[PDB]
């Protein structure tokens, strides 16, 4: 085994904490999340842990609502059970410097984008015409 080199994806790696959220309840409504789940999920201030090991990216969300973990290879679709218990087919790619996560279920689709902006990790969640912006800071 030799030490691998880095990647552009290293800008995402680390431990992040949610510091702001806008329009998340409206995004969740558009997604189809029920009232009680929306209320509890909207209160959560997760930590998000992003790591890379070879071609495998792991995104771990630790919260008081749910914990989730996904591991994947860019461009390669996988099964995901979301925090609100949708069973989706997901593909994550890069669009420039943006991690683009598309989730498909029940004939619906939503896109989550993660991008570095200054010292922040900005998350855009889009369902149809509804966008929510969530901002993480280094933990
Ligand atoms: C709560 C439900 C809609 C699933 C869910 C949970 C977290 C997030 C964003 C990506 C984040 O990690 O802050 C989007 C969607």
From Swiss-Prot:
Presence of keyword Cytoplasm: yes
Q: Which GO terms describe its molecular function?
A: fatty acid binding; hormone receptor binding; long-chain fatty acid binding; long-chain fatty acid transmembrane transporter activity
Transmembrane helix is among the record's keywords: no
Top-level taxon in the UniProt lineage? Eukaryota
Binding locations of a fatty acid? 134-136
Which terms are listed as keywords in the entry?
Acetylation, Cytoplasm, Lipid-binding, Nucleus, Phosphoprotein, Transport
User: Per its UniProt record, what Pfam families does this chain match?
Assistant: Lipocalin
* PTM sites of type Phosphotyrosine: 27
Q: Which InterPro entries match?
A: Calycin, Fatty_acid-bd, ILBP, Lipocln_cytosolic_FA-bd_dom
Q: Which family does it belong to?
A: Belongs to the calycin superfamily. Fatty-acid binding protein (FABP) family.
Q: What does this protein do?
A: Lipid transport protein in adipocytes. Binds both long chain fatty acids and retinoic acid. Delivers long-chain fatty acids and retinoic acid to their cognate receptors in the nucleus.
Known partners and oligomeric status: Monomer. Homodimer. Interacts with PPARG.
Q: Name it.
A: Fatty acid-binding protein, adipocyte
Q: Which organism is it from?
A: Homo sapiens
């Amino acid at each position: 085994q030799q030490m691998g080199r880095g990647s552009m994806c290293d800008a995402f790696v680390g431990t992040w904490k949610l510091v702001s959220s806008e329009n998340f309840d409206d995004y969740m409504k558009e997604v189809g999340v029920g009232f009680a789940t929306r209320k509890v999920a909207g209160m959560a201030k997760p930590n998000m842990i992003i790591s890379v090991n070879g071609d495998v990216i792991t995104i771990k969300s630790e919260s008081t609502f749910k914990n989730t973990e996904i591991s994947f290879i860019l461009g390669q679709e996988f099964d995901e059970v979301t925090a609100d218990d949708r069973k989706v087919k997901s593909t994550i790619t890069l669009d420039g410097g943006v991690l683009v996560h598309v989730q498909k279920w029940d004939g619906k689709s939503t896109t989550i984008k993660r991008k570095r902006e200054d010292d922040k990790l900005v998350v855009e969640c889009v369902m149809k015409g509804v966008t929510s912006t969530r901002v993480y800071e280094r933990a």
